Symmetry: C4
Subunit: 469 residues, 4 copies
């Protein structure tokens, strides 16, 4: 990277210590920017969803893959569930989205409960596969709670055949009382749903698909047990990418696991982490890892940094690791708690081929968690970090309660967090457009048409903390 003259700080830098200096630009608008990645992951946007049980679900996988991103499933999920989710996701359409199907005999409470797990704002009543009507919020609200769907269902809705142009769909929905555009198969049965905003996004984003034209998906594995067997089983289950993640990625056990997985030669790229040092990056790459995650205790007040004085500011660590990987011909991923689009922009500018997003996406409809209401009725969802205590207890296999409690004594608390959900941008795409708009604005400011040029022609500067007063 390039810094302004005289800017040679005597400390590692974080995202608050740096800024991008505008340069000569030839890009007209944001839409003239290509966000495709070159790390081999096949993502059309530099966004990866973290393998967190409260985040990495199936609806996230569908939506993110439809919008060009990728999702990594949690490592603790059973192989059968993994295969089921992979089959479900690869069976989804690239243009229309799977809506919520409700029986006419279902209750109002269950109706709204299944309604609030999608961002469409409506649910389709299905009888033998044919839509009869739509149920929305404020339609099941304010009514007697013992009523059923048939007593509140609205039979009037817009209908279109498969293959209809999204522009035509939006034009039809220009005056529609309800923005929903339920999609019907040529036989007549339900074949997905579409939305005017979704129709617009269909012309902006490009879904990430494999050689078969099906949405890509990634899975995570540990370093305990037969790593090779689990990796091969996941690959046979349909997984496209393999992730090996742990708190400390420079330990020899990570090297052994990477060598074991690389020996099988599954023919898929490997993501390994986490390390924050160039030496660790070199060791991981030489061990057989094509992608290296970066970021350990990135915050100055994070749980890891408070518990132990171990960590590193995200920016400098990412810069060094990316430099090492490019020297060795690899790629790096930027983990470490992304909270603003500025974080993504700086990660891209530092040399990271992709960015990893965790708890931020927890407060969304598509998240596996259920939506709850707080003291002030404001929606929120609980978060449990990397995994819950019950989850880690399940990974400890069949062990004596004495040994289990002995191991859990040193273990910290669940540290559950109440991630509020923004009403204006509650949808997952309502965050993806936000982040991508930030990144595209950055690219226009720099004057780069794609991410490699963004890394090539970026000039950075440093500011003190007195500007934060």
């Amino acid at each position: 990277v390039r810094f302004l003259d005289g800017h040679t700080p005597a400390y590692d830098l974080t995202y608050n210590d740096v800024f991008v200096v505008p340069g000569r630009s030839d890009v007209a608008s944001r839409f003239d920017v290509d966000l495709s990645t070159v790390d081999g992951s096949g993502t059309t946007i530099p966004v990866v969803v973290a393998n967190m049980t409260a985040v990495a679900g199936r609806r996230m996988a569908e939506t993110v893959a439809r919008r060009g991103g990728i999702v990594v499933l949690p490592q603790d999920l059973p192989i059968t569930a993994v295969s089921e989710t992979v089959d479900f996701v690869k069976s989804r359409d690239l243009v229309v989205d799977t809506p919520v199907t409700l029986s006419p005999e279902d209750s109002v409470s269950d109706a709204n409960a299944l309604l609030h797990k999608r961002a469409h704002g409506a649910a389709v009543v299905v009888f033998e596969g044919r839509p009869i009507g739509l149920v929305t919020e404020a339609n099941c609200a304010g009514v007697d709670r013992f009523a059923r769907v048939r007593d509140i269902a609205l039979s009037d809705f817009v209908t279109a055949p498969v293959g209809t142009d999204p522009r035509e769909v939006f034009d039809l929905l220009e005056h529609a009382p309800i923005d929903v555009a339920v999609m019907t198969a040529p036989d007549g049965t339900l074949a997905g749903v579409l939305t005017r905003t979704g129709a617009i996004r269909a012309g902006i984003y490009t879904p990430a698909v494999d050689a078969k034209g099906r949405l890509r998906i990634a899975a995570a594995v540990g370093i305990n047990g037969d790593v090779g067997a689990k990796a091969q089983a996941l690959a046979e289950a349909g997984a496209d990418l393999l992730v090996i993640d742990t708190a400390h990625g420079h330990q020899a056990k990570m090297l052994d696991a990477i060598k074991a997985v690389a020996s099988l030669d599954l023919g898929l790229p490997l993501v390994a982490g986490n390390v924050v040092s160039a030496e660790g990056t070199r060791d991981l790459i030489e061990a057989g890892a094509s992608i290296v995650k970066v970021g350990v205790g990135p915050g100055a007040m994070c749980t890891t940094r408070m518990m132990t004085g171990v960590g590193r500011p995200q920016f400098s660590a990412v810069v060094e690791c990316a430099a090492a990987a490019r020297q060795l011909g690899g790629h790096v991923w930027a983990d470490g708690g992304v909270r603003h689009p500025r974080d993504v922009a700086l990660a891209l500018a530092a040399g990271a081929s992709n960015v990893m997003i965790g708890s931020w996406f927890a407060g969304t409809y598509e998240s596996p968690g259920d939506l709850l209401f707080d003291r002030d009725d404001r929606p929120y969802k609980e978060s449990y970090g990397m995994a819950s205590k019950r989850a880690v207890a399940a990974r400890t296999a069949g062990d004596s309660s004495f040994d289990r409690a002995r191991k859990g004594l040193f273990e910290e608390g669940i540290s559950t967090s109440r991630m509020s959900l923004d009403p204006a941008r509650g949808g997952v795409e309502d965050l993806l457009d936000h982040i991508t708009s930030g990144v595209r604005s950055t690219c226009t400011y720099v004057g780069a048409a794609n991410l490699p040029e963004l890394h090539e022609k970026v000039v950075l500067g440093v500011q003190s903390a007195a500007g934060f007063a």
Copy 2:
């Protein structure tokens, strides 16, 4: 600029990182300081009002031009409205101000609504052009709301002929129950209003006027459409200064627009922006720009800096750009959210020929926005940034709703802000005197009689952030 020995920070500086060291002074008082500008803008004070729809109105133009400043009209205004406003402003008096004229049959609510858009605190009732009386607050307040002006108008007021000395006017108003000094033409008809504070200010400030003795005015243009045609039309409409502003001023489209406007050779100075780099400043100047605006994402927590890691601390950017412009024989303007007179003082000390003020002036009577009352009855006015979403939608010309929504998807929210209005200093001049007093005190402390000397003989220093605890 000159810094104390040993002060060579390893980071860019902002306004909180620097201070001015007092030096040998020969200036007796604040009044012995000349604030005239040398950038060619013709302003007698280093204040420029930003081209914001919620700020750049007509009353601001009149008051600011009467006090020596300049105002730039928004670029989205129709040409007819621009010409009308230019004619109205150039038809105003250089000593007296245009009051609010109320019909005797008007209602109390409308009376106070038209009363609260000026700082005089009174409105003149007009019948065939002759004053009959004055209506003030607490005069229409506490009365029956269906009453009319004639039922509350006070026919007793002070009257003077045109040409009366301001000192005489103040002496007459020494014992006046109402400080208003409504001004009558020699025929007898209304010819403006005067105020004791305004009379005092008439001897302090110098209105900015053109070769014809009429108040100067500036206009802004974009880089979309026929830039040359719009610039020439605005010049023919009576505009004195042309401003070309955009988020990123170093892009080639800015260069093309500047070249196109300079080819016509309208004979007026050009203001171009925004850039924060010396290279961008050189490119803009060589392209045909006489004045360069500075400041992109100046705040460490501003919307631009949060969305993208793009920006620069205001002080260092201004210093570098001013150095480049002086090397090339140009001038720079200091944009970037001025909030305290310290900001203006440091901008002047850094080498900026003028300072640009935006949202701060929103909370004023003279602002185009209407005054509102909050939950605690405290007055406030809404702000919409550079422009409102409806405004930008209007600039997108005639486009399909599909394309309009597609372009607006990436667009952020309106981000309206409630700018409170200070009761003690609610008037625009009540902020101009504040800022000018700060600047004059700075000049006295340094020991400079005018801005060029202020830039020449200023010595600065650097402080850490621990002083902010």
Copy 3:
């Protein structure tokens, strides 16, 4: 001064940026430290009270001079009042303090009002000069408000002759129900009051007196009018020290005033200010000033620094000015808003011969202001900065209201502040002991028996702002 190896900061330092490293010490206890000053002011402690109308009163003068300090009267006081106060103070005793004298016919409200202007907590009823009894708080409280002193006066009190040893007085008051020790002249009439804490302090502090054994006192003058005439009149009035103070002390008018006063050769030391530069210090000393005040806009968020970017961190300015004065054989005084004893300690360590204390002493019983009660009944006193607006209006002499308002337009607000009074340490001595204890502890830590050694053998260090998180 001496700094640790490698500590060469690239910025000016303030009190939060430095610390004192302990060294080899031979001092046994705090009492083994001599706090006498060598600047020629004659103060036995390095404390000077600022010339603020809300602070520099007569009770402060008496108490502070009895405790070894000095007080400078405000420059706006009439010469007759100055002479009266000087005569009153020089007529006071060096061991006992003047109590509050109340007539037996006075009302309860007036009784407590005159009671709460002294820290003794009691008032002596006087009839023809002989005490009859004492009235205290909770004695006039809870009673009918129309009652009088004679109905609540307590005739039982301790009495001693003049010349009694303070140790004997304390021993007698060991079991006294009321700690007051009203003092009687050999004739029988009242000759002062004494307190057990005051008796203890009599053996610790040394009152500052002139060649005649009377308490010393200082006065302040401006630079407007006949400076020499006012200075000579004040000297004839009995003033011991002369202070010439203004916002900017490096202006030529200060030089002319200093030369004019020095020409008369009144035979008293001169205090001049304020400057923060070595050049200004040299100019003031060569002009005929023996003591130079330091400190202009010392706070990073003070009114002066917000209004203008003019100022300097207190520590570095004091260091440089003290170095210059010692090079020229002079002395410096440390002004600039002392708030903690750490401030005094660092001022002494930097090389300052004395320290100037302002608003901190406002919240005290001895302050000229009257004690008020807030919303939460917590006592407080108002402060008006250097002087009130009415005061500065009075200094503008006989001028036309037009000119007066013209000059006051640029003048800022009164900026009155509510200085809370600490119930535990409400007395002035309750702050002097605090500050002196801090200074003595510093001296013991360094290992110096007096202030010159404290300046000679002090080693300092620098810390970052991250320790303030």
Copy 4:
């Protein structure tokens, strides 16, 4: 120590300015780390409890010595009490803990009062030395307050013989309704209590014992009076370690006291303090001190730093002192208000052989203070700093009230603090496991099997304060 390239700050560093960079690691788990100390103190963990009257009790001594730490008794305790406490502690078991013994005739209020001074949550009723039953909270709660133990005692409890394996004890208590495991001597009488968590900890920690297999204990002495006589008497009383502590440890009186104690040659290591300078450390070591305490006014807002500008950031002072001691072949201890395990980790990394913990342990059951309930029923305990005012008054021996008050005038307030007690981790071991887990995680991250390697192969870095926004 080793710092990253280019990190040469121009200021002293504190714990917030530094971080540990992860390195190559071979340690498998936390349990593979040896925490034994090499300073000669005999502690198996790097934890020392401060000699504070509100902290250094007898229950702390027992628990901490059982868990491998050491405790220093306050210097003001009478010699008889010291000998009694030493005998009591050395008479305790190394595996089981002494429970609370309650008479059956005691009242409910007294029952719970004696119950809440231990972390077991139960009390054993004793008749002639044989248990009859257990009384717990919520068992004496909600009952009539005049009832007695016999009316609420639960006679059903688990019983085991002495010598039973802790693993067997836990296995038996796997299904026990009450986790208490009251321990019976082979005769049948009470011989201690055990807990499942305590049983687990018995296999993790190693109690610190002397050559006789009895728990070690330390005592503190002053520099007033016959230091040698008191030191010899304490050594004869059974004390294992001697501590000489004062506010300023570089004074000559400390040197004389150290020489006097070393002349007797009691054959025990000497702890001396406090100093923060290398010169002071060298002087103390040459005077006959084997261990040097570090830390004077470590906080930027502590009472010492506010009273006097004397102090030093803890990290840099510890680094320098440890370097000096290692150069001279000694050891250092890290005092200065430890509040988080990060503090301990950085102290160990800097080169400190041990860490000293003060007020943090005040909010614990084992603390000598009694548990109180606040306004919100939340438990808390008062703290009085190093010692209470009554305590220091008692150390002033037999002195006249006049002299006592004279000395106490300069003395500051008691500064009592309400240390809240965490319900989840209210036990002392519930903090020891926390701290040790943090330290072990640090060791694993660095890749060191013991503290000397932790100091040897640690690499540190520096961060700015802008990360704290």
